[PDB]
Ligand binder design. Structure first.
Ligand SMILES: Nc1nc2c(ncn2[C@@H]2O[C@H](COP(=O)(O)OP(=O)(O)OP(=O)(O)O)[C@@H](O)[C@H]2O)c(=O)[nH]1
Ligand SMILES: Nc1nc2c(ncn2[C@@H]2O[C@H](COP(=O)(O)OP(=O)(O)O)[C@@H](O)[C@H]2O)c(=O)[nH]1
Ligand SMILES: [Ca+2]
Ligand SMILES: [Mg+2]
Ligand SMILES: [Mg+2]
Lengths: 440, 427
């Protein structure tokens, strides 16, 4: 059992969903029509990949996923795309009018019209579960749906499913691909509203991903397609422990124990390696030591920040492919005597390690080289607060003049919600500061 | 005098299975449950651990417990997986998430009654039940949290029976999660009150032995469990084979425990060997005696020279000169008499058993009640305090209904235990 239900909200959530589920299918040998030849138990099973796929009597493996967007044109492409047979039509939910980069419309005006239908379809997946573990929620910070509707959904999910675990993959805005001037507003509002209702959230800085595509894959002007294929690899690495089995395999929930010292401190920093082109990977093998050392190059992080100027509260290494503990231990011992790695004084310094022997996979016609071994580091660093600081500053610049605020007030919101949300962010920045101070 | 065995959680079931594997071979019992041995010594007291079944089949008096089916499914498909009574497999589905509270108060409380039904069913078959032995870790959720819950409830229903445990202590050198010191401290509190005998099996010591002594660059849990199964076989030898000394769990307790709370033992073993690595040279008796007393052979990462022995039980196995044994045993005490308390006369007792373990022509198992064990609890207390002073990772516990006060009490009681051990070190 231990089923996980994925919920993809808004354009960013949906399109990243497309990348992830395409990638999962290739990893598990699932065809676009949903058939899986290697799977001999027809109509059901207790295998590890069943945490993410349900099975029909006809042998179809169906994603435990819901796609939601307040406008139809993004999900329509799924309905008519390569993997359209993969999803039951009821898993793909669309309204007629989007939130127009407005949190208020996503949470209230437009969102309230479809929220009940969404919860009903989610309920239908959950009742098929024999032991539901929790939810994985994909969304942008900047969009009106990604911000507004997500926070509404997360609130409602806490009511309907109690303390059942809820994880986030949140797309943090970058100006190179930004769509709205008000994305700082939407970011602060959804972060404030979802904070109590999320157990663990993996932020993905679009600029971090943008830079990696430019620097490591030599993509002059990365598209969402370039970004999402890279993002899906990090997501795959994180969910791999749920979808595969193995002796040295460590469940994501075990890492979670280490990553979250306090409820509000639940934002791990992700760092992935190797990201390399076919051209460069040719006749060049990246060893365990090399990819592990790459995890401490800030250029490889999913979020722009400097952990070297912060303190660690946890360090997890999630390997996949040709990797054995001996090489990991050797690589770690080398790194600790050469990197700027400093822990807070109230936490142990040991690195927690997981290994999935299933090697990395790449999507056809993709920019990433196929490698024998990869690693995703999940660390809890005070430095990730830098991402909050940058967003909060941009928020302050506009809110001081109340720029664009009338678009929110016009949809029923009050200025008190802005100030309340900003105060919570200030407390959160202070929290990350407090945990880094030495004990008395 | 029957013993009821219980194994709880991942660690508990993994060493528990290995234990039944090892002693089944010693008693000539195959995975089918059939006897195929050449000595009658093997069957004389086989009733202590095994129930007799149809076709003269022997079935372990063992109860397997976990809050998830993973590890127990591995046991059932393991080497001697079929020997176990299938009805004695009692498992939940939710797991404990390395959380003491989940094992003790919520998830485990839901399952514990089912376990006690099996314990009770086994106990009434017993002609004269002497007690229980539990195998578990203290660093996780099930074995630590639910295991101590089981102990408390067994004591309620069998308050005049002996409770014994093999308790694996957590170590940062071999660590799954950061909250192991929390789980362990809460568990030690339970153990101090509700067991008569606890074998402290330190993962720190097991790691160091594998690395420093056995020259294993990167030891696994499988390697660590080679040492545990070897130790467990030895400390139960006097219970499984005919003899006059420490033959039941109560007489062992009366000889090993001068004060009720001070019942945490350091196990030792010689010769130390790694898996597969064949030994060709049999140790002399002086060598066995010297090694079994050396810190490098202790299964608890404590320096015995930093404390004093209250009581000692030693068991030599194999074909040897019992006169040479008594000579060497007397020499250790007479050469290092300072490390034995003078106010317990003749506190070292020795047994001998003709049957050696598998692969060795002779061996010695050590069971010491030393005040030096405080170093183990002090170590846990320091790791506990480092996090607790900032109330770090506590939300995992308060979320299951626990209050901070309960941590404070557990902390205080373990520090009391430490000071009690210190009291007799300077007597
Ligand atoms: N990485 C990545 N980011 C995306 C993608 N699509 C949109 N974004 C980012 O998401 C933010 C805009 O939010 P959207 O998800 O597009 O808007 P929405 O969720 O549909 O909400 P609406 O306003 O109602 O349309 C911008 O910062 C974009 O850069 C994508 O496919 N991949
Ligand atoms: N010696 C040994 N220790 C183990 C084993 N498995 C887990 N541990 C230790 O026990 C603690 C984890 O507890 P675990 O048994 O996995 O939790 P549980 O399944 O909820 O009871 C850690 O300190 C581990 O180092 C094992 O097979 N052998
Ligand atoms: Ca199947
Ligand atoms: Mg949209
Ligand atoms: Mg475990």
């Amino acid at each position: 059992m231990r089923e996980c239900i994925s919920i993809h909200v808004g354009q960013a959530g949906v399109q990243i969903g497309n990348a992830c589920w395409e990638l999962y299918c290739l990893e598990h040998g699932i065809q676009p029509d949903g058939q899986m030849p290697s799977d001999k138990t027809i109509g059901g099973g207790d295998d590890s990949f069943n945490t993410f796929f349900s099975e029909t009597g006809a042998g179809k493996h169906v994603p435990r996923a819901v796609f939601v967007d307040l406008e139809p044109t993004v999900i329509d492409e799924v309905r008519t795309g390569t993997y359209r047979q993969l999803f039951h039509p009821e898993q793909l939910i669309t309204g007629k009018e989007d939130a127009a980069n407005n949190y208020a419309r996503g949470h209230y005006t437009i969102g309230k019209e479809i929220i009940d239908l969404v919860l009903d379809r989610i309920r239908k997946l959950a009742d098929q579960c024999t032991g539901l573990q929790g939810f994985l929620v994909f969304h942008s910070f900047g969009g009106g749906t990604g911000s507004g509707f997500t926070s509404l959904l997360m609130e409602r999910l806490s009511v309907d499913y109690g303390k059942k675990s809820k994880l986030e993959f949140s797309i943090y805005p970058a100006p190179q691909v930004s769509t709205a001037v008000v994305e700082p507003y939407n970011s602060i509002l959804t972060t404030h509203t979802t904070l109590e209702h999320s157990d663990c959230a993996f932020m993905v800085d679009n600029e971090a991903i943008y830079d990696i595509c430019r620097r490591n894959l030599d993509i002059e002007r990365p598209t969402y397609t370039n970004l999402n294929r890279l993002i899906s690899q990090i997501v795959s690495s994180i969910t791999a422990s749920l979808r595969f089995d193995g002796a040295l395999n460590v469940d994501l929930t075990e890492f979670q124990t280490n990553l979250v010292p306090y409820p509000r401190i639940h934002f791990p920093l992700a760092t992935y390696a190797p990201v390399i082109s076919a051209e460069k990977a040719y006749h060049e093998q990246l060893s365990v030591a090399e990819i592990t050392n790459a995890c401490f190059e800030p250029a490889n992080q999913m979020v722009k920040c400097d952990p070297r100027h912060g303190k660690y509260m946890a360090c997890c290494l999630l390997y996949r492919g040709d990797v054995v503990p001996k090489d990991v231990n050797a690589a770690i011992a080398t790194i600790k005597t050469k990197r700027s790695i400093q822990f807070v004084d109230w936490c142990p310094t040991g690195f927690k390690v997981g290994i999935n022997y299933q090697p990395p996979t790449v999507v056809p016609g993709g920019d990433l080289a196929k490698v024998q071994r990869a690693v995703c580091m999940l660390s809890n660093t005070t430095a990730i607060a830098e991402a909050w600081a940058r967003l909060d500053h941009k928020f302050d610049l506009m809110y001081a003049k109340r720029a664009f605020v009338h678009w929110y007030v016009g949809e029923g919101m009050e200025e008190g919600e802005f100030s309340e949300a900003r105060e919570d962010m200030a407390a959160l920045e202070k929290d990350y500061e407090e945990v880094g101070v030495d004990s008395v | 005098r029957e013993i009821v065995h219980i194994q709880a959680g991942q660690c508990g079931n993994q060493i528990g299975a290995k234990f039944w594997e090892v002693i089944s071979d010693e008693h000539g019992i195959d995975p089918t449950g059939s006897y195929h041995g050449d000595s009658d010594l093997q069957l004389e007291r086989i009733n202590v651990y095994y129930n007799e079944a149809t076709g003269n089949k022997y079935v372990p008096r063992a109860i397997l417990v976990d809050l998830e089916p993973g590890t127990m499914d591995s046991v059932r498909s393991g080497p001697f997986g079929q020997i176990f009574r299938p009805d004695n497999f009692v498992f939940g589905q939710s797991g404990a998430g390395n959380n003491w509270a989940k094992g003790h108060y919520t998830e485990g409380a839901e399952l514990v009654d089912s376990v006690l039904d099996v314990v009770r069913k086994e106990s009434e078959s017993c002609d004269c039940l002497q007690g229980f032995q539990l195998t578990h870790s203290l660093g996780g959720g099930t074995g630590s949290g639910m295991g101590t819950l089981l102990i408390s409830k067994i004591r309620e229903e069998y308050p005049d029976r002996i409770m014994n445990t093999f308790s694996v202590m957590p170590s940062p050198k071999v660590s799954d999660t950061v909250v192991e010191p929390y789980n362990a401290t809460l568990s030690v509190h339970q153990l101090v009150e509700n067991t008569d005998e606890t074998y402290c099996i330190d993962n720190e010591a097991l790691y160091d032995i594998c690395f420093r002594t056995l020259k294993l660059t990167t030891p696994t849990y499988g390697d660590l469990n080679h040492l545990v199964s070897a130790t467990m076989s030895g400390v139960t030898t006097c219970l499984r084979f005919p003899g006059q000394l420490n033959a039941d769990l109560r007489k062992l307790a009366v000889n090993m425990v001068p004060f009720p709370r001070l019942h945490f033992f350091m196990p030792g073993f010689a010769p130390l060997t790694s898996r597969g690595s064949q030994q060709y040279r049999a140790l002399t008796v002086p060598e066995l005696t010297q090694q079994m007393f050396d810190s490098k052979n202790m299964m608890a990462a404590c320096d015995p020279r930093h404390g004093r022995y209250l009581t000692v039980a030693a068991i030599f196995r194999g074909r040897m000169s019992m006169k040479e044994v008594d000579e060497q045993m007397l020499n250790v005490q007479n050469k290092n008499s300072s490390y034995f308390v003078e106010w317990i006369p003749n506190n070292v007792k020795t047994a001998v058993c003709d049957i050696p373990p598998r692969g060795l022509k002779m061996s010695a198992t050590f069971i010491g009640n030393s005040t030096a064990i405080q170093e183990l609890f002090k170590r846990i207390s320091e790791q506990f305090t480092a996090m607790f002073r900032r109330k770090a990772f506590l939300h995992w516990y308060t979320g299951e209904g626990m209050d901070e006060m309960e941590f404070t009490e557990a902390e205080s009681n373990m520090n009391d235990l430490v000071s009690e051990y210190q009291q007799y070190q300077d007597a």
